Design a protein. Structure first.
Ligand SMILES: [Mn+2]
Ligand SMILES: [Mn+2]
Ligand SMILES: [Mn+2]
Ligand SMILES: [Mn+2]
Ligand code: NA
Ligand code: NA
Lengths: 68, 67, 67, 67, 68, 68, 67, 67, 68, 67, 67, 67
């Protein structure tokens, strides 16, 4: 049937988790076609000094491969 | 000794992660009694042209069983 | 020594598990060279009116990098 | 907005892995509506004179809940 | 062939690990038929003035489904 | 080289996931120096009449040790 | 009560997952007594010109120990 | 929002599993305040001529931090 | 240095967890020398009908290998 | 903010763990830009007459994506 | 009877894996008494012009508590 | 096809990680035939006055069964 590929990215943002997810996906869309789903693997981040500096979300992005 | 049961749900939301959890809990409250705690097992979601179509949070909800 | 890369693919088929793995490997052959091994990570699928609709096998495929 | 539930079943069969999965899904269909997807968690089995006696596939079945 | 279902329960007891498991099974057998096996997934508990307040054992209980 | 330590904290908040993480970091920074990074290990919470009562985020906080 | 041992084998076959499991179990039968159950731990394999070369199934075989 | 800390201990006992947990909690109570919950991570132990020399239970203890 | 081997056993008992652990170890001692430690992997069991029939503890037993 | 990608490589060497890591990283440097960190995922190897033949280290290499 | 505590450290070094472990243990010795054993949890690192810049080994250090 | 067995060993050495792996493999050679691969599962060790006392590497060793 169809075949998909998964790439692992890390999105970062000062805004929050959804924004860091959206950041990776926005960059993914520049170079990968047929983006279909994602799976969060890790949530981490840096500290300083209003608390969280940046949120870092490690995620797999899954996309459909074309025929050839 | 009190006994609890855990049911696994996946809440979804186009808005965010809290909203997805809340969606699941709102539905669980309709058919399950004595809801006490939840544990998130997975965060995933779907992608469209806008980016995230929906956030999906897989979680277990634990509740106390009667008698 | 030699250096390998692993790509993660999801093969799908209505027929069964091996055919799902085979579907991923046939596509991988078109763009990847020196395919050597694979490792299954997840077996999942969709459900239709007759039972399984498609099997989906998530696998890592390992191949030698040139140079 | 949408909420799914997951139940954990063990399908068994003497015929093979796919058959064991089909067995769980067939029995699932009798009492669960909107069956959407499955996830295989464990493949195990019993052993007899002729090798495999029964294949046992532990899977989660996900299905959409009504509001 | 036969089809089984697993339900996840948490038994509790102020006495010990076995007693907590038995509490869960004793309750299970009031609403579930054909109980066959259990599998412990987690041991946790709460803490009081005297050490352990209650033991909490998270377990899966497996039972045959009737062909309904 | 440098040596870091990780401590496991659980932040809580009635507001959301980021707020819970910030609660833990805000407390961490009162007794720990040189906070560098955090890693989320679990998200759980409690349930009330209105859905989520409080969100509880389990996280590791990593900080450099002073060569003492 | 009674005591069981588990050994970890890897069965291989060009002819699929069930075939590889059966290969392991046939060999286990030759030198092990009181074979009772198996648990699949990994599925992997090698790749050749036609896709899968060999399927390799890593499993635990459980057997009762005599007293 | 209240904040908790988790410390990892290994309690040991020649008697049994509960006793090992209790050993750890008794010691934790000496230097940690507001002890609330524990989670067992590992059960292991040592072996002598008698069989089990000591049971060892690795656990996290969670307690509320002040200010 | 020294080399050890680990075998995986399943001890069973109606008495409880420690007894099922002791059961595997007693049988291990019949055929393996220099038993040194064990690690519990799984706790499961059968049901009927005073609750637990038998407790089943899956464990690795580690023992020192001799030179030759 | 910025976005990173991770690729999974297997470095090999007859000369040890660090050597295998370095082999992977040297190859990564040839076709990947902005290499920042690595995470070891598995250590395995092959066996020959003298013990270890090749050390094989599976690692993730993280690098910043240009915009 | 006996109770141990475990702390999670990250040793770093430019020299290799063993050196990074030794670095954590040396700093551990300054403030912790009765250091008994360690468990490596993660091996990771940073990458520079010459390949590995810093090795980072995340380990748990276990030590015996006084009564 | 061919069938393999995996035995789990713990190699120990004061020198380092490879020497620990080598110690396990040298002993395995005395009693096991057709040793083919190994997989590291855990790296741990003991601590003495100078830092690491012994490294202990837990590994699975895979070998072909005759027949
Ligand atoms: Mn949010
Ligand atoms: Mn098949
Ligand atoms: Mn007991
Ligand atoms: Mn080395
Ligand atoms: Na569950
Ligand atoms: Na911890």
């Amino acid at each position: 049937g169809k075949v998909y590929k998964k790439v692992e990215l890390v999105g970062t943002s000062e805004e929050g988790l959804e924004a860091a997810i959206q950041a990776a996906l926005a960059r993914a869309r520049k170079t990968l076609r047929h983006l279909d789903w994602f799976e969060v693997k890790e949530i981490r981040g840096t500290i300083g000094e209003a608390g969280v500096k940046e949120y870092q979300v490690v995620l797999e992005v899954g996309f459909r491969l074309e025929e050839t």
